[PDB]
Amino acid sequence: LKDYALEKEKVKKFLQEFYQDDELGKKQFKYGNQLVRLAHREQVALYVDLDDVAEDDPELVDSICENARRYAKLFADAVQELLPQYKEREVVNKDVLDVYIEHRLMMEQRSRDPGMVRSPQNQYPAELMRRFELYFQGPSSNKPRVIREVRADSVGKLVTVRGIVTRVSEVKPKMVVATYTCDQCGAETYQPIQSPTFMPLIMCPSQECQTNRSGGRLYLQTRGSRFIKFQEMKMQEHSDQVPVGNIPRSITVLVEGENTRIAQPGDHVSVTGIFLPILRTGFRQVVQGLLSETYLEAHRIVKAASIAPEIYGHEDVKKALLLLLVGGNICLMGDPGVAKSQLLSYIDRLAPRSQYTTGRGSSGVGLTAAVLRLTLEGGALVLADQGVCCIDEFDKMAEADRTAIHEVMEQQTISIAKAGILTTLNARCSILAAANPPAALLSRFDLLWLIQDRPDRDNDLRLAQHITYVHQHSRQPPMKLMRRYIAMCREKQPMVPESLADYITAAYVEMRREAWASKDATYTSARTLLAILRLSTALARLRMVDVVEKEDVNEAIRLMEMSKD
Amino acid sequence: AGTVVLDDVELREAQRDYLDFLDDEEDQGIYQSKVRELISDNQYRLIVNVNDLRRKNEKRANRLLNNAFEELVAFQRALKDFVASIDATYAKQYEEFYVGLEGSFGSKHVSPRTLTSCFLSCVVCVEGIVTKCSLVRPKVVRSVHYCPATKKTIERRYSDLTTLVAFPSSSVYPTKDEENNPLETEYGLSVYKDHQTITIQEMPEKAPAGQLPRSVDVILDDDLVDKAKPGDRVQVVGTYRCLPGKKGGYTSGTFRTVLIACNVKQMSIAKIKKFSKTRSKDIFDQLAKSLAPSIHGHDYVKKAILCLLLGGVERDLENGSHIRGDINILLIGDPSVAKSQLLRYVLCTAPRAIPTTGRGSSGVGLTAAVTTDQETGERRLEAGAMVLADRGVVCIDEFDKMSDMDRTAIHEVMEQGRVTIAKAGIHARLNARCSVLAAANPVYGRYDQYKTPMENIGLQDSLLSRFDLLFIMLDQMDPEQDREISDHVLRMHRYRAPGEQDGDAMTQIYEKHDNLLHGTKKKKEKMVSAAFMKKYIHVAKIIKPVLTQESATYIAEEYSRLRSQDSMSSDTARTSPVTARTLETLIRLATAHAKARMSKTVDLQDAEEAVELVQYAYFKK
Amino acid sequence: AGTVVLDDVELREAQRDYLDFLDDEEDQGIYQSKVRELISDNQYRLIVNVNDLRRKNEKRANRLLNNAFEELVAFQRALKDFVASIDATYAKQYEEFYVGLEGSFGSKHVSPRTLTSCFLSCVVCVEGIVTKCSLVRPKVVRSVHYCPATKKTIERRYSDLTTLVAFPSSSVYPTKDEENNPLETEYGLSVYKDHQTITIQEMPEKAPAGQLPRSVDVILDDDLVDKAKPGDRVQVVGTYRCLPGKKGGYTSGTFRTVLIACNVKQMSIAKIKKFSKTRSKDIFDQLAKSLAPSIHGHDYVKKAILCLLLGGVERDLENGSHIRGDINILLIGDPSVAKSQLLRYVLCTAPRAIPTTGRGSSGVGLTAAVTTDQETGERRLEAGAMVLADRGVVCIDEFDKMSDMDRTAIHEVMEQGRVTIAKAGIHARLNARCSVLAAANPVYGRYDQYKTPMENIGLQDSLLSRFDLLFIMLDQMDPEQDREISDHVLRMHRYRAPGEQDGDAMTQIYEKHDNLLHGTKKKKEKMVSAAFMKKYIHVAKIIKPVLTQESATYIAEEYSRLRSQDSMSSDTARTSPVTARTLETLIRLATAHAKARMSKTVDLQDAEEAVELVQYAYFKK
DNA sequence: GCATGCATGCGCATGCATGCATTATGCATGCATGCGCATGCATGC
DNA sequence: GCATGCATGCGCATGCATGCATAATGCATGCATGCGCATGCATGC
Ligand SMILES: Nc1ncnc2c1ncn2[C@@H]1O[C@H](COP(=O)(O)OP(=O)(O)O)[C@@H](O)[C@H]1O
Ligand SMILES: Nc1ncnc2c1ncn2[C@@H]1O[C@H](COP(=O)(O)OP(=O)(O)O)[C@@H](O)[C@H]1O
Ligand SMILES: Nc1ncnc2c1ncn2[C@@H]1O[C@H](COP(=O)(O)OP(=O)(O)O)[C@@H](O)[C@H]1O
Ligand SMILES: [Mg+2]
Ligand SMILES: [Mg+2]
Ligand SMILES: [Mg+2]
Ligand SMILES: [Zn+2]
Structure with a gap:
């Protein structure tokens, strides 16, 4: 064991030392600037990388890994001691909490002489005056672990995990230190909290009440108290790491002030955390002794082009898929044996927000939303808000699911009115559907693609060659960039000029006239014109042009003609 | 407590006996x-055969079976001594090691x-x-x-179940110093061990x-935490003890037994190599x-069926795409063509085999379900038949009687090999890679x-x-075929197990020749023993072959030839349509x-x- | 109790400091x-000078004086460590060793x-x-x-005063087995330590x-059991602590301090050998x-007086006969002849000297007494002045005022050197070998x-x-003798101690010459220092001489000559009668x-x- | 030497600080299961 | 495809074994010392 004073001094010198890294290509005092910002209310939390510390001392890193909480507290105290040195000016604008801190420090200077004896209980709690939080970043050398294999050997360690989010709790304030005022004195009493539950005090420990033996009684205050942002997270294993025949395991995470509001249900996250237990008192059990429940305390959470190049053919369908991804509802009907499911799988993997449903497995409560112990949790349609949703074997779905899907496509909101639920849910998502061989x-849909398997010898032979190539060389014959391109594209919004309207109008009229000439035609309406306008706007957005052009309209017309034929 | 023991004849003698038991010099x-x-494996417990102990020392075995705790303590002490003897460095890591038991307990x-x-x-x-x-x-266990x-x-050291009875003086968590200075718990330096509880029911x-x-x-203690799961058939050997109730004045006199x-x-090597290298084609010839x-x-x-047993190769690519490698078969035939006998044999031979008839299991019991746990209010997943049979075999007798919705549910398993489950509050993708056998009667009773x-x-x-293969079986009433069938059936009927007296009530690579089970004519050939067959099947399933350039063009040209012959096959009808899955089926069967x-x-x-x-399966006269 | 301590800066540093203190390399x-x-001596405690510790390490001395128990524990641990270091075999015999303290404590x-x-x-x-x-x-301490x-x-191990506070769980004597089988105590294997209590009063x-x-x-603990006796002047160094009262509900708040x-x-060697061998007769000449x-x-x-200081030789024979070896003297003289000065000087110089005047002590307080102890009802013996002064000196001033019965009592001590005591229930013979000085005034005031x-x-x-020697001293008023006496007295009066300023208020074998205490004429001779004189007296008292054949006949003939001259001494009277004791006195003085x-x-x-x-003492003009 | 004085000595009572002996009953909590309700799935015709 | 049956499913009440919380007073014993007694020692005259 080593004395904490030496390591505290080492921490202080490490914070004062580093000059190395700068983004603009120079040598910049990073931690000094961070501390100067921390001096005032220009930064309310600080993250420390354990890769940068590894340059000078690895034993510090190991001791931090095995005894993380103590080192977190030491780091907090060291930074708090360093803060006065770097301070250069008073606060330009301050809020209520700063007003208490300043007033308390001012009267502490007013009253306390340097020589008088002060009881250990007479000091201010450290965390009450502090207003900055410290968190750690996992070592790059350290390998992320699996939820199944963290056990009693990992209690108290520093770990990094990767998982899928399933449950998130709404933000609520959590108590840190409670403040009490006596009934017959001007003194203030502070009660730190480090337990799930606590018992409020009654009598006043202040010196004046003790000397007079007045028996004054304490009262809580909320303004003087310190509160923090608190969230609760549920994570599960990836399907890849599950052993044979088993079921994914789950873990519970707790989230602090600035880390709050980062993750959403359904996201894949990487969490740097400390593995700590909770002493459990409750119903009696078989085995005597001290049992506990484990949980994870987080400190950092981190979340034309070729489309599905493995699948041969369907180039126009791929262009339509690109337009749907870019944005301004697509349905595919095909014979069995044509890979429609794999296109939907690729779409789900590519999209940032996406969901993929297979049929009756996610039917009913899997869609819409339900009430659970009360909080309302949404289904796939709710999760895919402002994303893209994918549905396979559409015709096999129950009628209620199909009605809900139609409502989402047309109205873009869901309405639920049943015993216990009365809500309207926002679902601004575009739908891709797959089915086997109707007027609905x-x-309702904008674009339909009918894939008929005509047994042409040349096409079949080329498909066979492509499949043999895929199966043998495990690569197509000769996503991040695509995601970045789509993100940059969606930033702009082209506009339709006044003149082109006439041209568009003419086209529409002529199209309808042809549809009226061909009595075998089925549907033309203003919805088709709206779809054409949306496709042209999407193409103009792809060109990043401010004004809609002729080529976009021609390509949209050609795509609609190809789909209809 | 300052009380110590100086001499104990029984404990010292038992420790000496175990020391002599585990010498092996x-x-x-x-x-x-x-x-x-x-x-080498960093594990810290041993399993010892009870029958071996009884053979070497019957008195020690009798005492251990009749009295458990003290003898087990002596075993653990002897293990500590010998682990220190062989390598004292490794014994430093763990406090005490443990003993498992194995063998035929007999009356117990x-x-x-x-x-x-x-x-x-x-x-x-x-x-x-x-x-x-x-x-x-x-x-x-230990707090710092x-x-x-x-x-x-x-x-502070804790020992609760180490001693039979505990007292309020122990099991107290320290929080204050001798002068009331607060103490800070340091979880890194403490010691913890895992704990679990399970329940077992008679099958x-x-x-x-x-x-x-x-x-x-x-x-279940620290080592055996993850060794059990619900819905599993297990055998447990251990002590049977009473449970001490907490302190009280009046007791009813009924303990709890746990x-x-x-x-x-x-x-639940040279032979294989020689046989394979010498036989090549004759391997699958004899196995069939x-x-x-x-x-x-x-x-x-x-x-x-042999192709199912060996199977294809699972493949993955860069984009996360998955390609199926399992095979699926459907048999349709007249009654009494022994389809169910084939299904039962595949159940017996395959390692992970589960039988699920048509109406015996519904769509929920096939894949999985979600249940709300009343104890905590959370949502839990219960695996069905197909999820349990990961990388295994599911046999479905009377496949025609299955409802449409169940088959639509089975589509997800048959196409991609995964099951997607979702209900508000939880959603998951479970693995269900599996192979299916199915037998269905014709609609008209007889084909x-x-x-x-x-x-039909x-x-x-x-x-x-969705199915890789379709087969049609018929009962043709040819007099010579009927004669052969009768000969075979009555030869099997008249056979009796060797070593069993007549009239009573109730490993070589190649099986020994039998006069009745094989016949006089079959002396020129032999059949492969079941055990070697299973070993070879496992070894072959391990092996990972690769496709050659010679056969890819050949198979592609033949697929195109079949899809063109679709117009040429005028004298006969087609059992199954030819789609893109046929090419994958060709590659799978080749592998x-x-x-x-x-x-x-x-x-x-x-x-x-x-x-x-x-060609045989896809067309019929 | 499973509680243990991992680090303690103060205790470890103090132990290190004592380790460095007791190195001596x-x-x-x-x-x-x-x-x-x-x-070598099989003892198990050490005495360390406090002033030495303060000189080497003042902080440790300050802490030890201000705080005793913890520092003493550290001392004992360091002693155990160094005893193990020098000879680990010897440290096995004893559990823990102890530390004594010595030196000038000052304010304490x-x-x-x-x-x-x-x-x-x-x-x-x-x-x-x-x-x-x-x-x-x-x-x-330890029971078996x-x-x-x-x-x-x-x-079972016991530790009562090792810990500050004891509890009812400890200090319980086991009598029954876990199955109520009787246990037999085996006193040989147990461990015991002695215990005593004494009381000390201010002198x-x-x-x-x-x-x-x-x-x-x-x-008094096990080692110091027999180191004290009643009626003795001692100095005790030790801890001053409170005494824990036994359990109760209401306490008055007053502890007992023990x-x-x-x-x-x-x-309370070369120099001696050289001086003796060179001087021979001059030894006693200068000493006198x-x-x-x-x-x-x-x-x-x-x-x-020098003969008393050296003394005779005690002798014993086969039949158990005892022969006295002590000398006794009586001085009678006129007032102001400095008899009491001589008595006081003998008190100062002699090792065991006790002054007992005539009526100051009675016959009971001289020899011994028997008292009935009320606590137990037994009979106990209390020693008097002469029993305490075994092999010592008793000085009796104003010997004439002593009563007759006291002198009859002193007869037993003067003749045989033993005291016989008896009262129904007890009887003893105590040893009282001693020598007596006595000074008595003449009956007529002046001789x-x-x-x-x-x-007279x-x-x-x-x-x-009973007395060996009688001496008569007179104050003759010769003018030159008076001049010499006045010179000597005023020389002693005018003398002042060197190193003391005038007017203020209030080892070499031969003493340094002094101008006043010795005089100019005495420069040719020197006086012997007091310390060397005491050392030589002790060495001479140790030595055991033997009588030669040359002097025995000579002394016997002179004794016969004296007993015949009894008729020849006509011009002078005899002070003391001549009996058989005179011959023993001759031999004693010779020795x-x-x-x-x-x-x-x-x-x-x-x-x-x-x-x-x-001849000088026995006759006077 | 005999007559007298007298400091020492012993046994049983009370007063006062510490110390010793005694000792079941009533109320609260979690596990098991009935009873009313709405959703939803499956099965006919 | 629409009308009906119905095995599954959920939330709040009571009943019953274990388990939890409470909580000074009166009587006995050894140490200190007074008061009556007989023996015995020492001191005069
Ligand atoms: N154009 C194609 N290119 C490559 N592979 C294809 C193509 N069409 C079909 N396949 C293969 O055929 C299989 C089709 O199965 P699936 O997509 O599940 O059919 P469906 O989606 O109609 O149920 C896929 O595994 C895929 O590998
Ligand atoms: N090829 C065959 N070899 C041996 N026995 C046969 C054969 N075909 C039929 N059998 C006999 O006929 C019976 C058929 O029963 P089963 O297998 O239940 O027929 P299915 O499954 O067609 O209803 C079996 O008991 C079997 O002994
Ligand atoms: N021979 C001597 N030498 C020195 N001083 C003497 C001598 N004789 C007598 N004195 C003095 O005379 C005093 C006699 O007092 P002290 O000894 O009490 O006499 P005594 O003992 O005879 O009554 C002493 O103080 C001493 O100083
Ligand atoms: Mg599909
Ligand atoms: Mg059958
Ligand atoms: Mg005198
Ligand atoms: Zn107050």
Whole structure:
């Protein structure tokens, strides 16, 4: 064991030392600038990398890994001691909490002489005056672990995990230190909290009440108290790491002030945390002794082009898929044996926000939302808000699910009115559907693609060659960039000029006239014109042009013609 | 407590006896290599055969079975001594090691229904199924605290179940110094061990008909935490003890009995190389021929079943795409063509085999379900038949009686091999990679020859495309074929097991020739033994072949030839449509044949065999 | 209790400091040889100078004086470490060793009257007299028991005063087995340590006049059991602590304070060989001359006092007969002849000297007494002045005022040297070998010259025969003798101690010459230093001379000559009768002179000196 | 030497600080299961 | 495809074994010392 004073001094010198890294290509005092910002209310939390510390001392890193909480507290105290040195000016604008801190420090200077004896209980709690939080970043050398294998050997260690989010709690304030005022004195009493539950005090420990033996009684205050942001997270294993025949395991995470509001249900996250237990008191058990429940305390959470190049053919369908991803509802009907499911899988993997449903497995409560112990939790349609949703084997779905899907496509909101639930849910998502061989699809959807397997010898032979190549060389014959391109594209919004309207109008009229000439035609309406306008706007957005052009309209017309034929 | 013991004849003698038991110097014992293996694998417990101990020292075995705790303590002390002797450095890591038990306990082999107070404080063996499991929880053993006021650290030791009875003086968590200075707990320096509780029920197959079941409660310590799961058939060997109730004045006199586990069991080269290298094609030839002597003929179905046993190759790519590697078969035939016998044989031979008939299991019991746990309010997943049979076999008898929705549910398993589950509050993707056997009767009771197979089968094209192979079996009443069948059946009927007296009531690579089971003519050939067959099947399943450039163009050209012959086949009808899945089926069967003969690459002969199978199955007269 | 301590800066640093204190490698320290002496003598405690510790390490001394128990524990641990280091074999015998303290404590030097609560928990030094003592009693430390029913032996450890506070769980004697089988105590295998309690009172000489005394209670452990006795002046160094009262509900708030002793003290070659061998006769010549410069003349009395200091030889024979070896003297003289000065000087110089005047002590307080102890009802013996002065000196001033019965009592001591005591229930023979000085005034105030000495002395012949020597001193008023006396007295009066300023208020073998204390004429001779004189006297008292054949016949013939001259001495009277004791006196004085000059045998010159002394003392003009 | 004085000595009562002996009953909590309700799935015709 | 049946499913009440919380007073014993008694020692005259 080593004395904490020496390591505290080492921490202080490490914070004062580093000059190395700068983004603009120079040598910049990073931690000094961070501390100067911390001096005032220009930064309310600080993150420390354990890769930068590894340059000078690895034993510090190991001791931090095995005894993380103590080192977190030591770091907090060291930074708090360093703060007065770097301070250069008073606060330009301050809020209520700063007003208490300043007033308390001012009267502490007013009253306390340097020589008088002060009881250990007479000091201010450290965390009450402090207003900055310290968190750690996991070592790059350290390998992320699996939820299944963290056990009693890992209690108290520093770990890094990767998982899928399933449950998130709404933000609520959590008590840190409670403040009490006596009934017959001007003194203030502070009660730190480090337990799930606590018992409020009654009598006043202040010196004046003790000397007079007045028996004054304490009262809580909320303004003087310190509160923090608190969230609760549920994570599960990836399907890849589950052993044979088992079921994914779950873990619970707790989230602090600035880390709050980072993750959403359904996201894949990487969490740097400390593995700590909770002493459990409750119903009696078989085995005597001290049992506990484990949980994780987080300190950092981190979340034309070729589309599905493995699948041969369907180039126009791929262009339509690109347009749907870029944005301004697509349905595919095909014979069995044509890979429609794999296109939907690729779409789900590519999209940032996406969901993929297979049929009756996610039917009913899997869609819409339900009430659970009370909080309302949404289904796939709710999760895919402002994303893209994918549905396979559409015709096999129950009628209620199809009605809900139609409502989402047309109205873009869901309405639920049943015993215990009365809500309207926002679902601004575009739908891609797959099915096997109706007027509803033609009337409601925007674009339908019919894939018929005509046994042409040349096409079949080329498909066979491509499949053999894929199976043998495990690569197509000769996503991050695509995601970045789509993100940059969606930033702009082109506009339709006044003149082109006439041209568009003419086209529409002529199209309808042809549809009226061909009595075998089925649907033309203003919805088709709206779809054409949306496709042209999407193409103009792809060109990053401010004004809609002729080529976009021609390509949209050609795509609609190809789909209809 | 300052009380100490100076002499104890029984304990010292028992320790000496175990020391002599585990020496293995002047004997053919193996425990030395077992200890070396434990040191190599960083594990900290040993399993010792009870029958071996009884053979070497019967008195010690009798005492251990009759009295458990003290003898087990002596065992653990002897293990500590010998681990220190062989390598004292490794013994520093762990406090104390543990002993497992194994062998035929005899009279103490006891069912959960027959556990009684007569077996208390002894070591018992029990066979059952697991019904309830609990979350893993840590328990404190050694606690460490630090005092910022005085810069002093202290440590407290805990021992609760080490001693039979505990007192309020122990199990007290320290929080304050001698001068009331606060202490700060330091979780890194403390010591914890895992703890779990499970429940075991007598298997419904063994329980008397019409009677309610009986169950036992088991505690799993730090090592055996993850060794059990609900819905599992296990055998547990351990002590049977009473449970001390907490302090009180008046007691009713009824204790709680809990079984403390010590062993948990999941009940279940030159020859191979020479045989494979010498035989090559004859490997699969004999394996197909010697699949099941009890079944007469049907070489194609035997070949297909062997292809299921060997299987294809699972492949993955950069984009996360998944390509199926399993095979699926559907048999349709007239009654009494021994389809169910084939299914039962595949159940017996395959490692992970589950039978699920048509209406025996519904769509929920096939894949999985979600249930709300009343104890906590959370959502939990319960696995179905197909999820349990990961990388295994599911047999479906009377496949035609299955409802449409169940088949739509099975689509997800048959296409991609995964199951997607979702209900508000939880959603998951479970792995269900599996292979399916199915047997379905014709719609008209007996297969009509004149009508095309589409009318007789009565199944949609999508479901047919889901299956890799379709086979049709008929009972042709040829007098010579009937004579052969009668000969075979009566030869099997007249046979009696060797070593059993007549009239009573009730490993070589190649099986020994039998006068009746094989016949005089078959002396020129032999059949492969079942055990070697299983070993070879496992080895072949391990092997990973690769496709060659010679056969890819050949297979592609033949696929194009079939899709063009679609117009040429005018004299006969087609059983199944030809889609993109047919090419994958060709490659899969080629790889299965390449697995049959141990090699490194897929050759042309495997492609030819696959194509022969496809041509036979896909068209009928 | 499983609680343990991992780090403690203060205790570890203090142990390191004591380790460096007791190294004595790069220093002139002696403690290594002290430890070797302890190992040689089988003793198990050490005495360390406090001033030495303060010189080497002042902070440790300050902490030890201010805080005792923890620092003493650290000392004992360091002793165990170094005893193990030097010789680990010897450290096995004893559990833990102990530390004594010595040196000038300074402010903490405290009288029993000035002990206060301010010195609690510190190490204090106290000077006092012993008044009450108790019987030695054993105390159990480690207990061992055996069970004939199960043939098992157990051991229990006890620690009562090792810990500050004890609880009912400890200090319980085991009597039954876990199955109620009786246990048999085996006293041989157990461990016991002795225990005693004494009481100390402030000495009456130091207490303020007219005030009642105050006392302290002391506990003596196993080593210091027999180191104290009642009626003894001692100095005790030890801890001053409170006494924990036994359990109760309501407490008055007054503790009992008891001093726990750690040290108990009874307050008190080439040169010698060369001086003796060179001087021979000059040894006793100078010793007689340099006996006391403060006293003028009287060479015969100085010779006699020197003979007392050296003494005779005690002899024993086969039949158990005892022969006296002590000498006794009586001085009678006119007032102001400095008899009391001689008595006081003999008190100062002699090792065991006790003054007992005529009526100051009675016959009971001289020899001994028997008292009935009210606590037990038994009979106990209390020693008197003469029993305490075994092999010592008793000085009796104003011997004439002593009553007759006291002198009859002193007869037993003077003749045989033993005291016989008897009262129904007890009888004993105590040893009282001793020598007596006595000074008595003449009956007529001033010695009458014309009357015979028998009238002036007024003592019976038996008592005179009891004494070895009689001397008569007179104040003759010769002008030159008076001038010499005045010179000597005023020279002594004008003298002042060197190093003391005038007008202020209030080792070499031969003493340095002084201008006034010796004089200019005496430069040709020197006087012997007091310390060397005491050392030589002790060495001479050790030496055991033997009588030669040359002098025995000579002494016998001279004794016969004296007993015949009894008729020849017509011009002078006889002071003392001549009996058989005179011959023993001759031999005794001869042996004393032979002791004066270190040799092996008694020679003729010693006999001649003895006879000169006898002739001078026994007759007067 | 005999007559008298008298400091020492012993046994049983009370007063006062510490110390010793005694000792079941009533109320609260979690596990098991009935009873009313709405959703939802499956099965006919 | 629409009308009906219905095995599954959920939330709040009571009943019953274990388990939890409470909580000074009166009587006995050894140490200190007074008061009556007989023996015995020492001191005069
Ligand atoms: N154009 C294509 N290119 C490559 N592979 C294809 C193509 N069409 C079909 N496949 C293969 O055929 C299989 C089709 O199965 P699936 O997509 O599940 O059919 P469906 O989606 O109609 O149920 C896929 O595994 C895929 O590998
Ligand atoms: N090829 C065959 N070889 C041996 N026995 C056969 C054969 N075909 C039929 N059998 C006999 O006929 C019976 C058929 O029963 P089963 O397998 O239940 O027929 P299915 O499954 O067609 O209803 C079996 O008991 C079997 O002994
Ligand atoms: N021979 C001597 N030498 C020195 N001083 C003497 C001598 N004789 C007598 N004195 C003095 O005379 C005093 C006699 O007092 P002290 O000894 O009490 O006489 P005594 O003992 O005879 O009554 C002493 O103080 C001493 O100083
Ligand atoms: Mg599909
Ligand atoms: Mg059958
Ligand atoms: Mg005198
Ligand atoms: Zn107050």
